[PDB]
């Protein structure tokens, strides 16, 4: 798996992408790695933000499916023409697969101006595939047509330019320290899990854990932030605020309506608490917890032209769709999407940003009763 190490790149805030090839002869493209969706979709027309795009006319192996797809989201969309073609991952396993490709022909607020990626690799399950679950996801096609074991793992580092590794079909023990702790995939649509307890600094929010997962809790490499349902966010923030009263901050800041700025190297992190999520374990009444630092929820905003200081965002926010464990969470950990056994493994990342005081941690076992009742029906 050393072939796959460091095979992800990116810029802060713009997501992590891997190099892929499509069609014959190979067209090289940088493709966003997204565990929060299930479509393999690539730019197929000269949108001006794009370095590159899929030229189907060049590919002997391309086959039109004579069906379109339309993918709306909040303030924007993409849409395209479905087909299949041969796909490889140069710094991945040594296979070639016939995959569904959504050739993106029109879009709105999808592509990022200044980004170096041109497509998206949805790694979640068929259930949430558009237009429907009959459209087989890439990773399904990859496993079905090859002897690649049914799992992948991600080490998202983020140092500006960010970096990481997507190990396809296996686990690289060099990417983590300590032991892997596993949480069940509640259902195969998103990578859905159950949070059973939340501690800020050690103290818990004392809320009906059912809330923590209203209506979902998911692991999503395509989201930057830790999202938290309305009520959980309220209490979450209420407590982080109390942990941090040493200095005063505006209301908008907590709502991600404004950024906060300190002077160069002048923001010791200790006015902010560590945050621990307890996840459902593999065994009845057994959990484990993952602990992240404020260096995870305080993310430097890359470049602001109207300033020169240490201006971080607050990487936590509300949600109507549920908890979303994004890069704020994932960059503390090596994460193993163990699809074969329906579970996600967390371990301390060999690359997470630690200091001389505190660290990201994964610890267990803990005893937690009624973890099932934490899941919404
Ligand atoms: C790069 C990009 C552009 C547009 C959209 C809508 C993107 O979303 C990526 C998804 O993984 C978003 N998550 C949000 C949480 O729920 C699952 C989908 C990415």
UniProtKB/Swiss-Prot annotation:
Residues 16-347 form the Peptidase A1 domain. It is a single-pass type I membrane protein. One of its GO terms (molecular function) is protein serine/threonine kinase binding. It is found in: Cell membrane; Golgi apparatus, trans-Golgi network; Endoplasmic reticulum; Endosome. Residues 1-377 are extracellular. Induction: Up-regulated by the Ca(2+)-regulated transcription factor NFATC4. Inhibited by RTN3 and RTN4. N-Glycosylated. Addition of a bisecting N-acetylglucosamine by MGAT3 blocks lysosomal targeting, further degradation and is required for maintaining stability under stress conditions. Acetylated in the endoplasmic reticulum at Lys-67, Lys-206, Lys-210, Lys-216, Lys-230, Lys-231 and Lys-238. Acetylation by NAT8 and NAT8B is transient and deacetylation probably occurs in the Golgi. Acetylation regulates the maturation, the transport to the plasma membrane, the stability and the expression of the protein. One of its GO terms (biological process) is amyloid-beta formation. The modification N6-acetyllysine is found at residues 67, 206, 210, 216, 230-231, 238. It comes from the Eukaryota. Its main location: membrane. Glycans are attached at residues 94, 113, 285. Disulfide bonds join 157-351, 209-374, 261-311. Its EC number is 3.4.23.46. One of its GO terms (cellular component) is dendrite. The keyword Isomerase does not apply. Expressed at high levels in the brain and pancreas. In the brain, expression is highest in the substantia nigra, locus coruleus and medulla oblongata. Monomer. Interacts with RTN1; RTN2; RTN3 and RTN4; the interaction leads to inhibition of amyloid precursor protein processing. Interacts with SNX6. Interacts with PCSK9. Interacts with NAT8 and NAT8B. Interacts with BIN1. Interacts (via extracellular domain) with ADAM10 (via extracellular domain). Interacts with SORL1; this interaction may affect binding with APP and hence reduce APP cleavage. Interacts with NRDC AND NRG1. Belongs to the peptidase A1 family. DXXLL motif is required for a proper endocytosis and retrograde transport to the trans-Golgi network, as well as for regulation of lysosomal degradation. The transmembrane domain is necessary for its activity. It determines its late Golgi localization and access to its substrate, APP. This is Beta-secretase 1. It comes from Homo sapiens.
